Amino acid sequence: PIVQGQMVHQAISPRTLNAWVKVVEEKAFSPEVIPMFSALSEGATPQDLNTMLNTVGGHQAAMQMLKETINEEAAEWDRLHPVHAGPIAPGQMREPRGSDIAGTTSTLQEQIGWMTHNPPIPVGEIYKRWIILGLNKIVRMYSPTSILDIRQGPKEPFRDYVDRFYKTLRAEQASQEVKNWMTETLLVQNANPDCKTILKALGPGATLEEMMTACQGV
Amino acid sequence: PIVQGQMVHQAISPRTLNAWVKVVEEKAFSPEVIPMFSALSEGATPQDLNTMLNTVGGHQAAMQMLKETINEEAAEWDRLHPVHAGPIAPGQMREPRGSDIAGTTSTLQEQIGWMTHNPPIPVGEIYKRWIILGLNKIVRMYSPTSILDIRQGPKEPFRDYVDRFYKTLRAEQASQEVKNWMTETLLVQNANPDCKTILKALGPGATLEEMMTACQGV
Amino acid sequence: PIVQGQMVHQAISPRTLNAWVKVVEEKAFSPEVIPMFSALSEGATPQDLNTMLNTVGGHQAAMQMLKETINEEAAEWDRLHPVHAGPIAPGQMREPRGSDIAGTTSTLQEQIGWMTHNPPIPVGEIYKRWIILGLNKIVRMYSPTSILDIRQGPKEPFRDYVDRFYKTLRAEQASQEVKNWMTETLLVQNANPDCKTILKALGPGATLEEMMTACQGV
Amino acid sequence: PIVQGQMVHQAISPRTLNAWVKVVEEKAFSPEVIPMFSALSEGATPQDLNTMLNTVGGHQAAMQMLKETINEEAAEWDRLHPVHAGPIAPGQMREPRGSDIAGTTSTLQEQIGWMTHNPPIPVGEIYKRWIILGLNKIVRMYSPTSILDIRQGPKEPFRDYVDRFYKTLRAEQASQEVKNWMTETLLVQNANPDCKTILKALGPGATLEEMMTACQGV
Amino acid sequence: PIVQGQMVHQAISPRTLNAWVKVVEEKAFSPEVIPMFSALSEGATPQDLNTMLNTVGGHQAAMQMLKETINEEAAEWDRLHPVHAGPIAPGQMREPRGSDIAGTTSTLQEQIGWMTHNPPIPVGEIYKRWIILGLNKIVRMYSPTSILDIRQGPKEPFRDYVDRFYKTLRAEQASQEVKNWMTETLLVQNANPDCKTILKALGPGATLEEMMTACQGV
Amino acid sequence: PIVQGQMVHQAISPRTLNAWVKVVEEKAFSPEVIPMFSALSEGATPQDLNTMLNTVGGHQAAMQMLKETINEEAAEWDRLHPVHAGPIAPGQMREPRGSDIAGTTSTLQEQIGWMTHNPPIPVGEIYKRWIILGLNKIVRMYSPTSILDIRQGPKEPFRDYVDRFYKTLRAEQASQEVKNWMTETLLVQNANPDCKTILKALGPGATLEEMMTACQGV
Amino acid sequence: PVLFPGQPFGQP
Amino acid sequence: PVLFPGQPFGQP
Amino acid sequence: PVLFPGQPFGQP
Amino acid sequence: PVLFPGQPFGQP
Amino acid sequence: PVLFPGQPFGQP
Amino acid sequence: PVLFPGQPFGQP
Ligand SMILES: [Cl-]
Ligand SMILES: [Cl-]
Ligand SMILES: [Cl-]
Ligand SMILES: [Cl-]
Ligand SMILES: [Cl-]
Ligand SMILES: [Cl-]
Ligand SMILES: [Cl-]
Ligand SMILES: [Cl-]
Ligand SMILES: [Cl-]
Ligand SMILES: [Cl-]
Ligand SMILES: [Cl-]
Ligand SMILES: [Cl-]
Ligand SMILES: [Cl-]
Ligand SMILES: [Cl-]
Ligand SMILES: [Cl-]
Ligand SMILES: [Cl-]
Ligand SMILES: [Cl-]
Ligand SMILES: [Cl-]
Ligand SMILES: [Cl-]
Ligand SMILES: [Cl-]
Ligand SMILES: [Cl-]
Ligand SMILES: [Cl-]
Ligand SMILES: [Cl-]
Ligand SMILES: [Cl-]
């Protein structure tokens, strides 16, 4: 990554790599892997991100899907940023193509040149956006359950049922409004009768804290 | 975080993340998790705090409650800080909205801009206040016991009983004065007879050291 | 802590926190915990010390006793440092109250302001003094044995007996002179006969090395 | 390595060495070892790379093959860069021979001199290229399977079969176009009938995500 | 410690403390503990050395012996450095007494003042000398064997016998010349007959390598 | 060590020491220990090297042999660098004797003075040369096998046999040309018949890759 | 509202 | 008093 | 395309 | 004397 | 040749 | 000689 008043470049540390590898091996494609990745690659260059993606042993199907997603994003970027004709002036620097953002046709010094520019051309955060999108699609695709199937057991504590519910919801393929609707509908809709009657008695304007406090005794 | 004479920005380290994750997995929602969190996020930006909160695997009900608490705090902040009309001057910077304090509508450079200002707009410590409040409500809600139920066993050493007492008191939902009253009343009130008579003989103006020394033999 | 030619402030590291927590969990309230604490909090601010004290899980009775000791120390400090009337001049800074030394009524920037002043107002080392005093009282109170009860077994090597002796002496509640007397009296007084006769033959002007060399064969 | 505005030289850290050694011992010659190596040797000098290669215990046949590959690369470099006659001027520095790039006939200060020059003579990245080529040949030679033999089991989930497929493909000895052909032909060609019919029905213009979603139920 | 062009002060790190503690717990009072100690306290101040000595749990007899040795050294230093009458000038600094070298009557800033002076008053290395002397006496006193008793077994390889020999010799209480004599006499004197005849045939002007090569077959 | 534009001195870190100790305990005197040592002591001073050598527990015979080798090297150095008569001028510094290079008669500041000079007097790399030579003699002496005895089993894969071969060759006591001859002769000479006929059919101008590919099926 | 169910912390 | 039962260290 | 099957990330 | 039995190292 | 069998990497 | 048996490395 590159950290701050001038910016300074440093390679990815051994324990950032080890951390990422062990996270992939232990948790595979759980939702919380996406923040960890973004946490382990803050300020990183395309070379660092490609380093983290190449160090993945196994899971080659998911890595291929991620490759295809990055291909879509880079192609769209090239569509939105057309090529221009001429040699680059001595003072200036060319604008990054989709292949340069992925670190394929760009050196480390060119990426540092884009990220250190004023105004900055944040190639690392753009490439990070594409990668994180692909990771979203992989996580949502490898989710075994559906939000519609989460139902509270007869003798299951309300806390556990809500845990399962939002656990499944976090990996769902839905926009913000759709998740709002799922929360305001299926949660009370799929609760067990003893607690479901109480939650219906509370009303749709109740907080989760009041719902879990209400069904704590049952 | 951002550490000091000029301030310098650095991302959250791999072992701060690993530390936080392992603390959540091992101790879940014990009181001492709140200092550790605050210890692992000193000088942190909203992006770092959201990084620590997003890396939590499971416990999604508690994370939802924390989300709602942050919603209340941000809404109140917007009420207290009304919007103003006009474009921002070149030299100045806008004042952070409730969505900017949570890092939702603000970039990392804007948060650094608010924290580096003179006078500083400490968005990270404000967001940290909201988060720590939500964590207080989660800890107090997930406490299994009550301060009223802690009673000393007949053959239990006084040290163990006091340990249980203040263990339960630390997670209680009570103001400072209410905890003062609980300490000055229930502790001697719920002691076993052999030691309770001695503690009554000491008087309400005795220290805890004199009480534990008094009941050490019994 | 704050380390050196100008002083620079840094938060407590993840492995200082982890070190302190694991030391408390493993060794609880052994004497050597007090140096370790002081070793893990060199140059620390009141916020760092309160961070280390708040991260203690369990042992809430001892933490309460420590709280009371700090209350005594702060009250005495306020007695010795009377309040003064007036607003603080722009160039100057107020003198810390007992509540400011404990980090309760003082921010981090104010503590840094007191520690960076010339002459320095070392609030962190003062608060550290109070805390270490309380830890002394906790260690001495949780000592299971007494210096008077340490007696050498008939077939116990002299090395082991001396180890037990000074082990108990280190946790004793006694001034320097009283410990000198305990060493010059009880050690030879409570040795087993075979070795006790030799140690009496050496005389009270012998070193511990000559005593242990003398009783090595027996 | 040497990191950045002037460049600064630092030796390889203990945990970079330990990381590399443990990676070799655990994973031997798996594909993902090549990125890890390149990740552990970013900005490194020929001395650092030779340090990492010499710390390998066992696997001496592969290390010999790597030696021979480096011999080929260095010989070719000397062919492309002919010697020149004369003593080096005081201000200038000689151009590196194939033996200097491998760190055999060059000191550490000379390598730092080549990497710090403007324009830089990146001896470390060149030597790194040769080494990584040799590692490619070792990985491809120690691959136990062939891309032609990967066939989906009758009751094997499509995800697992694709995982095996691209796992074998990553270690294959083939150019980019040949791998494109292998992907667009053998993958659907070697699928089990139930899923193979669906994949044939999709058409050769389908993404891997649509193929795995299509065969998820079967 | 204090490291270098001006000197900068830093406290002892958590893993230096942990390293020292674990070395004491694992290896107790083996010879190689003395270098490790000196390795963990390079450039250290009296406060750091007292920190390392106070963090020792158990072994209180040896710690007492070390205390007495330090008392002898400090008393001798005060004898060699007599007190002088007068107040210290504003520009100058007093000369350290034996109590100041041990960090008892000196603050951290005074020790930094002595070590940063030009010419330096190296109080930390002097105190380190006294401590290392005491550690020498403790190691030599806790050695279970004698150099005179090391004899080669009839079927013991020569390598093992030499290992035992120099293992015992390293902990011996003898000057350099006495150890030279022990090596040139007892080693061949206490070898088993089959090898002893060969070593006698070599002559007293043979290296250890030639002796071990000579007795390798037997 | 001392790292770089001015040089700065730092002591050996706790995990460099721990790394070295654990390497010695685990792998004893394997060839790859020599790079690791050189990797853990890059830029080190004689004091650091003596620190690493003194922290070795056990193996005292090998340490004695290393001592004797260093004695030979230092004596030769003194022969090649004769003493000169006179006091050292204020601006200059004496030339290091053989005892100064080993850190025996030289302080840390004098070694830093020699290594920081322009031109540098690299005492640390010279002492490192002597030490590494002694380590070469120890490794070659503690090798259990000979290059002449390595023969391929009848059903042993060619890869394993080559691994054993070069494993033994790396520890051999032979010059570069002698190792070239051993490789070009004994390897094909001591292969099993089925593969030996193929390797003879290839010719002496074949690479190791072609030999191992040729005998892969058998 | 600033945070929403099933959505990451600090997301627009 | 500066510290109180059941209350964190360094709390107002 | 910028990435290809069986090829490393960030390779020309 | 500078060090005393039962007393920490470096204590006044 | 620059590297040789049985010889360390980067050795003259 | 510069090093001696039973004596530490780098000792006078
Ligand atoms: Cl279900
Ligand atoms: Cl519940
Ligand atoms: Cl579920
Ligand atoms: Cl109860
Ligand atoms: Cl008790
Ligand atoms: Cl309880
Ligand atoms: Cl007893
Ligand atoms: Cl004894
Ligand atoms: Cl005892
Ligand atoms: Cl197969
Ligand atoms: Cl599937
Ligand atoms: Cl397979
Ligand atoms: Cl014996
Ligand atoms: Cl032998
Ligand atoms: Cl022995
Ligand atoms: Cl053999
Ligand atoms: Cl083979
Ligand atoms: Cl073998
Ligand atoms: Cl997320
Ligand atoms: Cl708290
Ligand atoms: Cl790769
Ligand atoms: Cl202490
Ligand atoms: Cl080597
Ligand atoms: Cl030593």
Numbering used by the authors:
A (entry chain A), B (entry chain A), C (entry chain A), D (entry chain A), E (entry chain A), F (entry chain A): 1 to 4, 8 to 221
G (entry chain B), H (entry chain B), I (entry chain B), J (entry chain B), K (entry chain B), L (entry chain B): 313 to 324
What does the publication say?
During maturation of human immunodeficiency virus type 1 (HIV-1), capsid proteins (CA) assemble into a conical core (or capsid) surrounding the viral genome. Formation of a core with optimal stability is a strict requirement for efficient HIV-1 infection. CA folds into two distinct domains connected by a linker: the N-terminal domain (CANTD), composed of seven α-helices and a single β-hairpin, and the C-terminal domain (CACTD), composed of a 310-helix and four α-helices. The cores comprise ~250 CA hexamers and 12 CA pentamers.
All structures have been solved in the native background, and thus encompass the authentic α9_hex1–α9_hex2 inter-hexamer interfaces. To help address this hypothesis we also solved structures of native WT CA complexes with CPSF6 (WTCPSF6) or Nup153 (WTNup153) peptides at 2.5 and 2.4 Å resolution, and analyzed them together with E45Aa and our previous native WT CA, WTCA, and WTPF74 structures, thus enabling structural comparisons in the context of native CAs bound to PF74/CPSF6/Nup153 ligands. The reason we could not rely on information on α9_hex1–α9_hex2 from previously solved structures of cross-linked CA in complex with CPSF6 (CAXL-CPSF6) or Nup153 (CAXL-Nup153), is that mutations W184A and M185A at the α9 helix severely affected the inter-hexamer region:37,39 specifically, we see significant differences between WTCPSF6 and CAXL-CPSF6 or between WTNup153 and CAXL-Nup153 at the 2-fold regions. Comparison of WTCA to WTCPSF6 or WTNup153 revealed some minor structural differences at the 2-fold and 3-fold regions, and binding of the CPSF6 or Nup153 to native WTCA CA (WTCPSF6 or WTNup153) or the cross-linked CAXL (CAXL-CPSF6 or CAXL-Nup153) was essentially the same. The shared CA binding site targeted by PF74, CPSF6, and Nup153 is near α9΄ of a neighboring CA within the same hexamer. At the same time, α9 forms the inter-hexamer 2-fold interface by interacting with α9 from a neighboring hexamer (α9_hex1–α9_hex2). Comparison of the E45Aa, E45A/R132T, WTCA, WTPF74, WTCPSF6, and WTNup153 revealed that repositioning of the α9 helix in E45Aa may lead to steric interference that could affect access to the PF74/CPSF6/Nup153 pocket.
